[PDB]
Design a binder for this molecule. Structure first.
Ligand SMILES: Nc1ncnc2c1ncn2[C@@H]1O[C@H](COP(=O)(O)OP(=O)(O)OP(=O)(O)O)[C@@H](O)[C@H]1O
Lengths: 183, 198
């Protein structure tokens, strides 16, 4: 993204500067047409350039990185490092998984993490997984409204689970097995 | 030839041959709450790097014997190495016996000594009788002596005269070193907290 902004004209070169580029993700995180979104939007750039707030007041109509590298997740070849597009990567995962369990894998595909806050990830995963998967199996995507910290929330719940007491490792067994415990 | 003198009780099991092995070797087994419940023997306590909370398995909790298993295990672990040089029929053993001990238990102990360890000879001398003989040898001009043996688990007032003990003026008292230690434990527990059992 810093290289993209350099092509634009800002030309940042260090983290102390591109902290604001990191922040740009707060608004420039949408993608609709994974194959031609950036071109179709550069052709009709209006009401899509959120104009991120630069410190110097430069509100230039950011309208290409709005759709460039939210899609880099689905198209690794777009960056330069090659890999299965995030969607087909998850698909290959559930494919290598068992056959019977693959139905529940299709039906319970969760999305979590700070990077998943991109509003378009849900719909794009829906479309790509429906294109890559059979017709009988549907895609019941579930993106929690607060997926930003879903991992932390679930961990805190698992920790403060009522009858989970017996499963905590303690000094008692540490003093006789140490790290040789289940690990 | 050499001989093996053995005195035994609740706290201490003092075995020694004609020249060395002079120490306070205990008689009970120790189990460490931390060392995977390993059962230690009389002298193996020195191998325990943390004797806190040791559970005591006692062949004697007071003057009389209980649970032969522990006593026989202690004797085997002692004999198995430098302490006695397990050789059996080469030498003999002299074991002490309480003032008024279980007749059946003591004769069965003699039976076991003759059968399993097969010492070429052993006798029924008394713990107080041995001290009486020691004192008589120390003072040959004496003809009568009273022994006040206040052991760690014993308190015996035993007379001796004309090389014979009389079973009428022979007193034993249950106030022993073990009782004193337990009372100190209880006092410290009660006066620092409401429970403490080390
Ligand atoms: N609302 C958001 N929209 C888009 N991107 C975001 C958002 N919030 C955070 N990010 C990006 O996601 C990253 C943080 O990831 P997240 O906190 O979800 O997991 P993480 O703990 O940071 O990563 P890891 O679990 O590997 O430590 C940040 O580097 C940030 O650029």
């Amino acid at each position: 993204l810093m290289k993209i902004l350099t092509e634009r004209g800002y030309s940042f070169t260090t983290t102390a500067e591109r902290e604001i580029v990191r922040d740009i993700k707060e608004k420039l995180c949408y993608v609709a047409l994974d194959f031609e979104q950036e071109m179709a939007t550069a052709a009709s750039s209006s009401s899509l350039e959120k104009s991120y707030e630069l410190p110097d007041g430069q509100v230039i109509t950011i309208g290409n990185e709005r759709f460039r590298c939210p899609e880099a997740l689905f198209q690794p070849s777009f960056l330069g490092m090659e890999s299965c597009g995030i969607h087909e990567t998850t698909f290959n995962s559930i494919m290598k998984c068992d056959v019977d369990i693959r139905k529940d894998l299709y039906a319970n595909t969760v999305l979590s993490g700070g990077t998943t806050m991109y509003p378009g990830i849900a719909d794009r995963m829906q479309k790509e997984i429906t294109a890559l998967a059979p017709s009988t199996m549907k895609i019941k995507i579930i993106a929690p409204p607060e997926r930003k910290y879903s991992v932390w929330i679930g961990g805190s719940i698992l920790a403060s689970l009522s009858t989970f007491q017996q499963m905590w490792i303690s000094k008692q067994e540490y003093d006789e097995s140490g790290p040789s415990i289940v690990h | 030839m050499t001989t093996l003198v053995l005195d035994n009780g609740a706290y201490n099991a003092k075995i020694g041959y004609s020249h060395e092995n002079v120490s306070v070797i205990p008689n009970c087994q120790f189990r460490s709450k931390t060392a995977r419940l390993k059962t230690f023997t009389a002298n193996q306590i020195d191998e325990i790097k943390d004797p806190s909370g040791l559970f005591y398995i006692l062949p004697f909790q007071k003057g009389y014997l209980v649970n032969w298993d522990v006593q026989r295990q202690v004797w085997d672990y002692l004999f198995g190495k430098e302490m006695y040089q397990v050789d059996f029929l080469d030498t003999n053993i002299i074991i002490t016996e309480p003032y008024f001990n279980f007749t059946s238990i003591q004769e069965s102990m003699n039976e076991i000594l003759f059968e399993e360890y097969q010492f070429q000879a052993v006798l029924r001398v008394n713990a107080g009788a041995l001290s009486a003989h020691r004192y008589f040898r120390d003072n040959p001009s004496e003809l009568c002596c009273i022994i006040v043996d206040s052991g760690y688990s014993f308190t015996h007032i035993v007379p001796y005269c004309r090389s014979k003990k009389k079973k009428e003026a022979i007193i034993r008292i249950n106030v022993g070193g073990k009782l004193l230690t337990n009372h100190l434990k209880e006092i410290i527990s009660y006066r620092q907290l409401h429970v403490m059992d080390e």
